């Protein structure tokens, strides 16, 4: 369930410079991260396949890429960041249900 929408370090570095990304930094031992996996998969399934996609939904396993999580100043798990090419990243804080996540992502995209 956590295998879906996983990015490599290289995919992350280039992806966040090519298009908007809502990225989940997580750990397999993170209980909140586990419960969030199915919602994040739905978000990815809906948006990552869209034609002419303006946003992409991805994951970075911190236990696989500690160097990436360190560089992103990750504090606590999961950490939800929206990256926009050129602009500065925004850490999401708030309820983690599908409707709220989607609405915040959409509002934050056009700012």
N, CA, C and O atoms as a Tinker XYZ file with bonds, in Angstrom:
   444  protein
     1  N      0.824000   -1.203000    0.000000    73     2
     2  CA     0.000000    0.000000    0.000000    64     1     3
     3  C      0.862000    1.259000    0.000000    63     2     4     5
     4  O      0.465000    2.291000   -0.540000    81     3
     5  N      2.041000    1.167000    0.607000    73     3     6
     6  CA     2.963000    2.297000    0.652000    64     5     7
     7  C      3.896000    2.299000   -0.556000    63     6     8     9
     8  O      4.653000    3.246000   -0.768000    81     7
     9  N      3.833000    1.227000   -1.342000    73     7    10
    10  CA     4.682000    1.071000   -2.518000    64     9    11
    11  C      4.252000    2.022000   -3.628000    63    10    12    13
    12  O      5.063000    2.429000   -4.460000    81    11
    13  N      2.970000    2.371000   -3.630000    73    11    14
    14  CA     2.394000    3.176000   -4.699000    64    13    15
    15  C      2.867000    4.623000   -4.641000    63    14    16    17
    16  O      2.945000    5.223000   -3.568000    81    15
    17  N      3.180000    5.174000   -5.811000    73    15    18
    18  CA     3.588000    6.571000   -5.956000    64    17    19
    19  C      4.891000    6.919000   -5.229000    63    18    20    21
    20  O      5.135000    8.082000   -4.908000    81    19
    21  N      5.720000    5.911000   -4.974000    73    19    22
    22  CA     7.039000    6.142000   -4.392000    64    21    23
    23  C      7.987000    6.784000   -5.399000    63    22    24    25
    24  O      8.044000    6.375000   -6.558000    81    23
    25  N      8.728000    7.791000   -4.948000    73    23    26
    26  CA     9.739000    8.429000   -5.782000    64    25    27
    27  C     11.136000    8.023000   -5.338000    63    26    28    29
    28  O     11.379000    7.807000   -4.151000    81    27
    29  N     12.053000    7.921000   -6.296000    73    27    30
    30  CA    13.466000    7.820000   -5.968000    64    29    31
    31  C     13.948000    9.209000   -5.573000    63    30    32    33
    32  O     13.222000   10.191000   -5.731000    81    31
    33  N     15.169000    9.292000   -5.060000    73    31    34
    34  CA    15.756000   10.585000   -4.743000    64    33    35
    35  C     15.879000   11.408000   -6.019000    63    34    36    37
    36  O     15.555000   12.596000   -6.037000    81    35
    37  N     16.350000   10.767000   -7.085000    73    35    38
    38  CA    16.539000   11.438000   -8.365000    64    37    39
    39  C     15.214000   11.934000   -8.947000    63    38    40    41
    40  O     15.151000   13.032000   -9.502000    81    39
    41  N     14.159000   11.130000   -8.822000    73    39    42
    42  CA    12.831000   11.531000   -9.292000    64    41    43
    43  C     12.302000   12.737000   -8.518000    63    42    44    45
    44  O     11.618000   13.592000   -9.082000    81    43
    45  N     12.620000   12.801000   -7.229000    73    43    46
    46  CA    12.186000   13.914000   -6.397000    64    45    47
    47  C     12.856000   15.215000   -6.821000    63    46    48    49
    48  O     12.190000   16.223000   -7.058000    81    47
    49  N     14.183000   15.180000   -6.914000    73    47    50
    50  CA    14.991000   16.351000   -7.240000    64    49    51
    51  C     14.557000   17.007000   -8.546000    63    50    52    53
    52  O     14.440000   18.230000   -8.627000    81    51
    53  N     14.321000   16.187000   -9.565000    73    51    54
    54  CA    13.951000   16.696000  -10.882000    64    53    55
    55  C     12.463000   17.018000  -10.977000    63    54    56    57
    56  O     12.066000   17.956000  -11.669000    81    55
    57  N     11.646000   16.234000  -10.279000    73    55    58
    58  CA    10.203000   16.383000  -10.327000    64    57    59
    59  C      9.720000   17.713000   -9.785000    63    58    60    61
    60  O      8.875000   18.371000  -10.391000    81    59
    61  N     10.262000   18.108000   -8.637000    73    59    62
    62  CA     9.859000   19.349000   -7.988000    64    61    63
    63  C     10.316000   20.589000   -8.757000    63    62    64    65
    64  O      9.915000   21.706000   -8.432000    81    63
    65  N     11.152000   20.391000   -9.771000    73    63    66
    66  CA    11.598000   21.505000  -10.602000    64    65    67
    67  C     10.865000   21.504000  -11.941000    63    66    68    69
    68  O     10.938000   22.473000  -12.697000    81    67
    69  N     10.159000   20.415000  -12.227000    73    67    70
    70  CA     9.439000   20.284000  -13.488000    64    69    71
    71  C      7.952000   20.592000  -13.348000    63    70    72    73
    72  O      7.337000   21.129000  -14.269000    81    71
    73  N      7.376000   20.252000  -12.199000    73    71    74
    74  CA     5.946000   20.450000  -11.979000    64    73    75
    75  C      5.593000   20.471000  -10.495000    63    74    76    77
    76  O      6.356000   19.986000   -9.660000    81    75
    77  N      4.430000   21.035000  -10.176000    73    75    78
    78  CA     3.960000   21.076000   -8.796000    64    77    79
    79  C      3.810000   19.676000   -8.214000    63    78    80    81
    80  O      3.233000   18.790000   -8.845000    81    79
    81  N      4.332000   19.486000   -7.010000    73    79    82
    82  CA     4.251000   18.197000   -6.337000    64    81    83
    83  C      3.767000   18.338000   -4.895000    63    82    84    85
    84  O      4.293000   19.145000   -4.129000    81    83
    85  N      2.761000   17.545000   -4.539000    73    83    86
    86  CA     2.355000   17.389000   -3.150000    64    85    87
    87  C      3.036000   16.119000   -2.660000    63    86    88    89
    88  O      2.633000   15.015000   -3.028000    81    87
    89  N      4.065000   16.268000   -1.832000    73    87    90
    90  CA     4.899000   15.125000   -1.460000    64    89    91
    91  C      4.756000   14.706000    0.001000    63    90    92    93
    92  O      4.851000   15.529000    0.911000    81    91
    93  N      4.527000   13.413000    0.205000    73    91    94
    94  CA     4.449000   12.835000    1.536000    64    93    95
    95  C      5.787000   12.210000    1.929000    63    94    96    97
    96  O      6.198000   11.200000    1.358000    81    95
    97  N      6.461000   12.813000    2.904000    73    95    98
    98  CA     7.665000   12.223000    3.479000    64    97    99
    99  C      7.261000   11.355000    4.663000    63    98   100   101
   100  O      6.687000   11.851000    5.633000    81    99
   101  N      7.558000   10.062000    4.585000    73    99   102
   102  CA     7.047000    9.119000    5.575000    64   101   103
   103  C      8.077000    8.094000    6.042000    63   102   104   105
   104  O      9.215000    8.069000    5.573000    81   103
   105  N      7.646000    7.253000    6.976000    73   103   106
   106  CA     8.426000    6.112000    7.423000    64   105   107
   107  C      7.483000    4.935000    7.639000    63   106   108   109
   108  O      6.355000    5.118000    8.098000    81   107
   109  N      7.942000    3.720000    7.307000    73   107   110
   110  CA     7.130000    2.513000    7.494000    64   109   111
   111  C      6.680000    2.301000    8.943000    63   110   112   113
   112  O      5.622000    1.714000    9.175000    81   111
   113  N      7.461000    2.765000    9.916000    73   111   114
   114  CA     7.100000    2.593000   11.324000    64   113   115
   115  C      6.147000    3.677000   11.836000    63   114   116   117
   116  O      5.638000    3.589000   12.954000    81   115
   117  N      5.913000    4.692000   11.014000    73   115   118
   118  CA     5.017000    5.781000   11.379000    64   117   119
   119  C      3.558000    5.344000   11.293000    63   118   120   121
   120  O      3.041000    5.087000   10.206000    81   119
   121  N      2.901000    5.262000   12.447000    73   119   122
   122  CA     1.516000    4.830000   12.526000    64   121   123
   123  C      0.543000    5.746000   11.805000    63   122   124   125
   124  O     -0.406000    5.277000   11.177000    81   123
   125  N      0.774000    7.050000   11.893000    73   123   126
   126  CA    -0.040000    8.016000   11.167000    64   125   127
   127  C      0.197000    7.904000    9.665000    63   126   128   129
   128  O     -0.728000    8.060000    8.868000    81   127
   129  N      1.442000    7.632000    9.288000    73   127   130
   130  CA     1.804000    7.467000    7.886000    64   129   131
   131  C      1.084000    6.268000    7.280000    63   130   132   133
   132  O      0.658000    6.308000    6.126000    81   131
   133  N      0.950000    5.201000    8.066000    73   131   134
   134  CA     0.262000    3.991000    7.625000    64   133   135
   135  C     -1.206000    4.263000    7.316000    63   134   136   137
   136  O     -1.711000    3.878000    6.261000    81   135
   137  N     -1.885000    4.928000    8.247000    73   135   138
   138  CA    -3.309000    5.211000    8.107000    64   137   139
   139  C     -3.578000    6.189000    6.970000    63   138   140   141
   140  O     -4.689000    6.249000    6.443000    81   139
   141  N     -2.557000    6.954000    6.595000    73   139   142
   142  CA    -2.694000    7.965000    5.549000    64   141   143
   143  C     -2.482000    7.390000    4.146000    63   142   144   145
   144  O     -2.937000    7.967000    3.159000    81   143
   145  N     -1.791000    6.254000    4.066000    73   143   146
   146  CA    -1.449000    5.631000    2.781000    64   145   147
   147  C     -2.611000    5.470000    1.785000    63   146   148   149
   148  O     -2.469000    5.836000    0.618000    81   147
   149  N     -3.764000    4.926000    2.229000    73   147   150
   150  CA    -4.851000    4.754000    1.255000    64   149   151
   151  C     -5.402000    6.079000    0.720000    63   150   152   153
   152  O     -5.764000    6.167000   -0.453000    81   151
   153  N     -5.469000    7.102000    1.565000    73   151   154
   154  CA    -5.947000    8.410000    1.134000    64   153   155
   155  C     -4.979000    9.027000    0.127000    63   154   156   157
   156  O     -5.394000    9.597000   -0.882000    81   155
   157  N     -3.689000    8.904000    0.415000    73   155   158
   158  CA    -2.662000    9.460000   -0.450000    64   157   159
   159  C     -2.617000    8.717000   -1.786000    63   158   160   161
   160  O     -2.285000    9.303000   -2.816000    81   159
   161  N     -2.949000    7.431000   -1.764000    73   159   162
   162  CA    -3.023000    6.658000   -2.999000    64   161   163
   163  C     -4.183000    7.113000   -3.883000    63   162   164   165
   164  O     -4.049000    7.189000   -5.104000    81   163
   165  N     -5.320000    7.414000   -3.259000    73   163   166
   166  CA    -6.470000    7.952000   -3.979000    64   165   167
   167  C     -6.136000    9.292000   -4.625000    63   166   168   169
   168  O     -6.476000    9.535000   -5.783000    81   167
   169  N     -5.468000   10.158000   -3.868000    73   167   170
   170  CA    -5.036000   11.457000   -4.373000    64   169   171
   171  C     -4.127000   11.296000   -5.580000    63   170   172   173
   172  O     -4.246000   12.028000   -6.563000    81   171
   173  N     -3.218000   10.330000   -5.498000    73   171   174
   174  CA    -2.290000   10.058000   -6.576000    64   173   175
   175  C     -2.987000    9.452000   -7.776000    63   174   176   177
   176  O     -2.699000    9.815000   -8.917000    81   175
   177  N     -3.906000    8.525000   -7.524000    73   175   178
   178  CA    -4.626000    7.863000   -8.606000    64   177   179
   179  C     -5.466000    8.850000   -9.403000    63   178   180   181
   180  O     -5.606000    8.716000  -10.619000    81   179
   181  N     -6.024000    9.840000   -8.717000    73   179   182
   182  CA    -6.869000   10.825000   -9.376000    64   181   183
   183  C     -6.058000   11.836000  -10.185000    63   182   184   185
   184  O     -6.442000   12.198000  -11.296000    81   183
   185  N     -4.940000   12.287000   -9.626000    73   183   186
   186  CA    -4.208000   13.412000  -10.204000    64   185   187
   187  C     -2.999000   13.060000  -11.074000    63   186   188   189
   188  O     -2.730000   13.745000  -12.060000    81   187
   189  N     -2.272000   12.005000  -10.721000    73   187   190
   190  CA    -1.036000   11.685000  -11.436000    64   189   191
   191  C     -1.235000   11.236000  -12.879000    63   190   192   193
   192  O     -0.304000   11.286000  -13.683000    81   191
   193  N     -2.445000   10.799000  -13.204000    73   191   194
   194  CA    -2.721000   10.233000  -14.520000    64   193   195
   195  C     -3.431000   11.220000  -15.438000    63   194   196   197
   196  O     -3.543000   10.987000  -16.641000    81   195
   197  N     -3.910000   12.321000  -14.866000    73   195   198
   198  CA    -4.616000   13.346000  -15.632000    64   197   199
   199  C     -3.804000   13.839000  -16.826000    63   198   200   201
   200  O     -2.584000   13.980000  -16.740000    81   199
   201  N     -4.486000   14.100000  -17.935000    73   199   202
   202  CA    -3.825000   14.672000  -19.096000    64   201   203
   203  C     -3.581000   16.149000  -18.831000    63   202   204   205
   204  O     -4.469000   16.859000  -18.359000    81   203
   205  N     -2.370000   16.608000  -19.138000    73   203   206
   206  CA    -1.955000   17.985000  -18.877000    64   205   207
   207  C     -2.038000   18.295000  -17.381000    63   206   208   209
   208  O     -2.585000   19.324000  -16.981000    81   207
   209  N     -1.493000   17.400000  -16.566000    73   207   210
   210  CA    -1.563000   17.527000  -15.113000    64   209   211
   211  C     -0.799000   18.742000  -14.596000    63   210   212   213
   212  O      0.334000   18.996000  -15.007000    81   211
   213  N     -1.429000   19.487000  -13.694000    73   211   214
   214  CA    -0.806000   20.669000  -13.110000    64   213   215
   215  C     -0.162000   20.341000  -11.769000    63   214   216   217
   216  O      0.650000   21.110000  -11.255000    81   215
   217  N     -0.530000   19.194000  -11.209000    73   215   218
   218  CA     0.009000   18.768000   -9.926000    64   217   219
   219  C      0.228000   17.258000   -9.920000    63   218   220   221
   220  O     -0.495000   16.514000  -10.581000    81   219
   221  N      1.230000   16.817000   -9.170000    73   219   222
   222  CA     1.521000   15.398000   -9.025000    64   221   223
   223  C      1.600000   15.034000   -7.551000    63   222   224   225
   224  O      2.035000   15.838000   -6.726000    81   223
   225  N      1.178000   13.818000   -7.225000    73   223   226
   226  CA     1.155000   13.360000   -5.842000    64   225   227
   227  C      2.133000   12.204000   -5.649000    63   226   228   229
   228  O      2.027000   11.176000   -6.319000    81   227
   229  N      3.084000   12.374000   -4.734000    73   227   230
   230  CA     4.183000   11.425000   -4.594000    64   229   231
   231  C      4.544000   11.153000   -3.140000    63   230   232   233
   232  O      4.045000   11.812000   -2.228000    81   231
   233  N      5.420000   10.173000   -2.939000    73   231   234
   234  CA     5.907000    9.812000   -1.613000    64   233   235
   235  C      7.426000    9.701000   -1.624000    63   234   236   237
   236  O      8.017000    9.299000   -2.626000    81   235
   237  N      8.055000   10.059000   -0.508000    73   235   238
   238  CA     9.478000    9.805000   -0.315000    64   237   239
   239  C      9.708000    9.060000    0.998000    63   238   240   241
   240  O      9.553000    9.626000    2.080000    81   239
   241  N     10.079000    7.789000    0.890000    73   239   242
   242  CA    10.388000    6.974000    2.058000    64   241   243
   243  C     11.693000    7.432000    2.710000    63   242   244   245
   244  O     12.776000    7.234000    2.159000    81   243
   245  N     11.579000    8.045000    3.885000    73   243   246
   246  CA    12.742000    8.596000    4.578000    64   245   247
   247  C     13.769000    7.528000    4.944000    63   246   248   249
   248  O     14.966000    7.810000    4.991000    81   247
   249  N     13.311000    6.307000    5.204000    73   247   250
   250  CA    14.241000    5.228000    5.527000    64   249   251
   251  C     15.016000    4.782000    4.293000    63   250   252   253
   252  O     16.051000    4.123000    4.401000    81   251
   253  N     14.506000    5.147000    3.123000    73   251   254
   254  CA    15.182000    4.860000    1.866000    64   253   255
   255  C     16.023000    6.058000    1.416000    63   254   256   257
   256  O     17.034000    5.891000    0.734000    81   255
   257  N     15.600000    7.259000    1.799000    73   255   258
   258  CA    16.297000    8.472000    1.383000    64   257   259
   259  C     16.438000    9.470000    2.527000    63   258   260   261
   260  O     15.858000   10.555000    2.493000    81   259
   261  N     17.213000    9.091000    3.538000    73   259   262
   262  CA    17.432000    9.937000    4.706000    64   261   263
   263  C     18.059000   11.270000    4.321000    63   262   264   265
   264  O     17.777000   12.298000    4.936000    81   263
   265  N     18.911000   11.247000    3.301000    73   263   266
   266  CA    19.557000   12.459000    2.808000    64   265   267
   267  C     18.557000   13.464000    2.233000    63   266   268   269
   268  O     18.727000   14.673000    2.388000    81   267
   269  N     17.517000   12.960000    1.574000    73   267   270
   270  CA    16.477000   13.824000    1.025000    64   269   271
   271  C     15.653000   14.465000    2.138000    63   270   272   273
   272  O     15.396000   15.668000    2.118000    81   271
   273  N     15.242000   13.651000    3.106000    73   271   274
   274  CA    14.423000   14.129000    4.212000    64   273   275
   275  C     15.182000   15.126000    5.072000    63   274   276   277
   276  O     14.606000   16.087000    5.580000    81   275
   277  N     16.479000   14.889000    5.230000    73   275   278
   278  CA    17.329000   15.809000    5.964000    64   277   279
   279  C     17.377000   17.157000    5.252000    63   278   280   281
   280  O     17.278000   18.209000    5.883000    81   279
   281  N     17.530000   17.113000    3.932000    73   279   282
   282  CA    17.642000   18.320000    3.120000    64   281   283
   283  C     16.326000   19.087000    3.062000    63   282   284   285
   284  O     16.320000   20.296000    2.835000    81   283
   285  N     15.215000   18.387000    3.267000    73   283   286
   286  CA    13.906000   19.037000    3.256000    64   285   287
   287  C     13.476000   19.499000    4.644000    63   286   288   289
   288  O     12.347000   19.953000    4.834000    81   287
   289  N     14.382000   19.382000    5.609000    73   287   290
   290  CA    14.118000   19.811000    6.970000    64   289   291
   291  C     12.913000   19.128000    7.588000    63   290   292   293
   292  O     12.133000   19.759000    8.301000    81   291
   293  N     12.758000   17.836000    7.316000    73   291   294
   294  CA    11.614000   17.079000    7.813000    64   293   295
   295  C     11.621000   16.961000    9.336000    63   294   296   297
   296  O     12.611000   16.539000    9.932000    81   295
   297  N     10.505000   17.338000    9.954000    73   295   298
   298  CA    10.325000   17.221000   11.397000    64   297   299
   299  C      9.021000   16.482000   11.677000    63   298   300   301
   300  O      7.938000   17.025000   11.458000    81   299
   301  N      9.120000   15.247000   12.159000    73   299   302
   302  CA     7.936000   14.459000   12.447000    64   301   303
   303  C      7.335000   13.823000   11.205000    63   302   304   305
   304  O      7.644000   14.223000   10.082000    81   303
   305  N      6.474000   12.832000   11.409000    73   303   306
   306  CA     5.978000   12.015000   10.306000    64   305   307
   307  C      4.484000   11.749000   10.439000    63   306   308   309
   308  O      3.998000   11.449000   11.529000    81   307
   309  N      3.750000   11.860000    9.322000    73   307   310
   310  CA     4.303000   12.224000    8.013000    64   309   311
   311  C      4.477000   13.732000    7.884000    63   310   312   313
   312  O      3.860000   14.496000    8.626000    81   311
   313  N      5.314000   14.159000    6.947000    73   311   314
   314  CA     5.433000   15.572000    6.617000    64   313   315
   315  C      4.906000   15.797000    5.205000    63   314   316   317
   316  O      5.365000   15.166000    4.253000    81   315
   317  N      3.941000   16.701000    5.079000    73   315   318
   318  CA     3.294000   16.964000    3.800000    64   317   319
   319  C      3.706000   18.327000    3.242000    63   318   320   321
   320  O      3.385000   19.365000    3.821000    81   319
   321  N      4.416000   18.314000    2.120000    73   319   322
   322  CA     4.895000   19.545000    1.501000    64   321   323
   323  C      4.402000   19.676000    0.068000    63   322   324   325
   324  O      4.389000   18.703000   -0.686000    81   323
   325  N      3.997000   20.887000   -0.299000    73   323   326
   326  CA     3.632000   21.189000   -1.675000    64   325   327
   327  C      4.731000   22.013000   -2.332000    63   326   328   329
   328  O      4.978000   23.153000   -1.939000    81   327
   329  N      5.389000   21.435000   -3.332000    73   327   330
   330  CA     6.471000   22.121000   -4.029000    64   329   331
   331  C      5.963000   22.748000   -5.317000    63   330   332   333
   332  O      5.236000   22.113000   -6.081000    81   331
   333  N      6.349000   23.994000   -5.555000    73   331   334
   334  CA     6.016000   24.670000   -6.799000    64   333   335
   335  C      7.292000   25.183000   -7.455000    63   334   336   337
   336  O      8.061000   25.917000   -6.834000    81   335
   337  N      7.520000   24.795000   -8.722000    73   335   338
   338  CA     8.730000   25.120000   -9.489000    64   337   339
   339  C      9.081000   26.604000   -9.446000    63   338   340   341
   340  O      8.312000   27.445000   -9.912000    81   339
   341  N     10.244000   26.920000   -8.885000    73   339   342
   342  CA    10.681000   28.296000   -8.752000    64   341   343
   343  C     10.344000   28.875000   -7.392000    63   342   344   345
   344  O     11.165000   29.556000   -6.776000    81   343
   345  N      9.131000   28.602000   -6.924000    73   343   346
   346  CA     8.654000   29.146000   -5.659000    64   345   347
   347  C      9.153000   28.329000   -4.469000    63   346   348   349
   348  O      9.846000   27.326000   -4.641000    81   347
   349  N      8.796000   28.766000   -3.265000    73   347   350
   350  CA     9.201000   28.076000   -2.045000    64   349   351
   351  C      8.127000   27.096000   -1.589000    63   350   352   353
   352  O      6.936000   27.321000   -1.802000    81   351
   353  N      8.558000   26.007000   -0.959000    73   351   354
   354  CA     7.657000   24.931000   -0.561000    64   353   355
   355  C      6.793000   25.319000    0.631000    63   354   356   357
   356  O      7.192000   26.137000    1.460000    81   355
   357  N      5.605000   24.725000    0.710000    73   355   358
   358  CA     4.684000   24.991000    1.807000    64   357   359
   359  C      4.320000   23.701000    2.527000    63   358   360   361
   360  O      3.770000   22.779000    1.924000    81   359
   361  N      4.629000   23.640000    3.817000    73   359   362
   362  CA     4.278000   22.477000    4.625000    64   361   363
   363  C      2.804000   22.501000    5.011000    63   362   364   365
   364  O      2.321000   23.483000    5.575000    81   363
   365  N      2.092000   21.422000    4.707000    73   363   366
   366  CA     0.687000   21.336000    5.078000    64   365   367
   367  C      0.532000   20.964000    6.544000    63   366   368   369
   368  O      1.229000   20.087000    7.054000    81   367
   369  N     -0.391000   21.643000    7.213000    73   367   370
   370  CA    -0.755000   21.317000    8.583000    64   369   371
   371  C     -2.269000   21.411000    8.704000    63   370   372   373
   372  O     -2.862000   22.443000    8.387000    81   371
   373  N     -2.890000   20.333000    9.165000    73   371   374
   374  CA    -4.336000   20.276000    9.266000    64   373   375
   375  C     -4.843000   18.861000    9.079000    63   374   376   377
   376  O     -4.052000   17.933000    8.916000    81   375
   377  N     -6.175000   18.685000    9.101000    73   375   378
   378  CA    -6.798000   17.364000    8.960000    64   377   379
   379  C     -6.347000   16.661000    7.688000    63   378   380   381
   380  O     -6.082000   17.310000    6.676000    81   379
   381  N     -6.258000   15.337000    7.737000    73   379   382
   382  CA    -5.701000   14.578000    6.625000    64   381   383
   383  C     -6.709000   13.658000    5.936000    63   382   384   385
   384  O     -6.351000   12.581000    5.458000    81   383
   385  N     -7.967000   14.087000    5.889000    73   383   386
   386  CA    -8.984000   13.389000    5.110000    64   385   387
   387  C     -8.891000   13.836000    3.653000    63   386   388   389
   388  O     -8.321000   14.887000    3.359000    81   387
   389  N     -9.449000   13.040000    2.743000    73   387   390
   390  CA    -9.308000   13.285000    1.306000    64   389   391
   391  C     -9.807000   14.660000    0.873000    63   390   392   393
   392  O     -9.094000   15.403000    0.197000    81   391
   393  N    -11.031000   14.992000    1.264000    73   391   394
   394  CA   -11.666000   16.237000    0.844000    64   393   395
   395  C    -10.875000   17.471000    1.275000    63   394   396   397
   396  O    -10.740000   18.425000    0.509000    81   395
   397  N    -10.354000   17.448000    2.497000    73   395   398
   398  CA    -9.596000   18.580000    3.018000    64   397   399
   399  C     -8.239000   18.697000    2.334000    63   398   400   401
   400  O     -7.817000   19.790000    1.959000    81   399
   401  N     -7.559000   17.565000    2.175000    73   399   402
   402  CA    -6.275000   17.537000    1.484000    64   401   403
   403  C     -6.408000   18.051000    0.052000    63   402   404   405
   404  O     -5.609000   18.873000   -0.396000    81   403
   405  N     -7.420000   17.564000   -0.658000    73   403   406
   406  CA    -7.641000   17.966000   -2.042000    64   405   407
   407  C     -7.901000   19.463000   -2.135000    63   406   408   409
   408  O     -7.272000   20.164000   -2.928000    81   407
   409  N     -8.833000   19.946000   -1.319000    73   407   410
   410  CA    -9.192000   21.359000   -1.318000    64   409   411
   411  C     -8.027000   22.292000   -0.995000    63   410   412   413
   412  O     -7.885000   23.346000   -1.614000    81   411
   413  N     -7.195000   21.907000   -0.030000    73   411   414
   414  CA    -6.033000   22.719000    0.323000    64   413   415
   415  C     -5.010000   22.726000   -0.803000    63   414   416   417
   416  O     -4.439000   23.767000   -1.126000    81   415
   417  N     -4.782000   21.559000   -1.398000    73   415   418
   418  CA    -3.854000   21.439000   -2.517000    64   417   419
   419  C     -4.288000   22.340000   -3.671000    63   418   420   421
   420  O     -3.475000   23.066000   -4.244000    81   419
   421  N     -5.573000   22.285000   -4.002000    73   419   422
   422  CA    -6.117000   23.066000   -5.107000    64   421   423
   423  C     -6.048000   24.571000   -4.851000    63   422   424   425
   424  O     -5.672000   25.338000   -5.738000    81   423
   425  N     -6.409000   24.991000   -3.643000    73   423   426
   426  CA    -6.322000   26.399000   -3.265000    64   425   427
   427  C     -4.877000   26.900000   -3.290000    63   426   428   429
   428  O     -4.608000   28.015000   -3.738000    81   427
   429  N     -3.955000   26.074000   -2.807000    73   427   430
   430  CA    -2.552000   26.470000   -2.689000    64   429   431
   431  C     -1.828000   26.483000   -4.036000    63   430   432   433
   432  O     -0.846000   27.205000   -4.209000    81   431
   433  N     -2.313000   25.687000   -4.984000    73   431   434
   434  CA    -1.714000   25.641000   -6.317000    64   433   435
   435  C     -1.760000   26.983000   -7.036000    63   434   436   437
   436  O     -0.748000   27.446000   -7.563000    81   435
   437  N     -2.934000   27.603000   -7.057000    73   435   438
   438  CA    -3.089000   28.900000   -7.705000    64   437   439
   439  C     -2.932000   30.065000   -6.729000    63   438   440   441
   440  O     -3.901000   30.755000   -6.409000    81   439
   441  N     -1.706000   30.274000   -6.263000    73   439   442
   442  CA    -1.400000   31.401000   -5.388000    64   441   443
   443  C     -0.157000   32.142000   -5.867000    63   442   444
   444  O      0.253000   33.125000   -5.249000    81   443
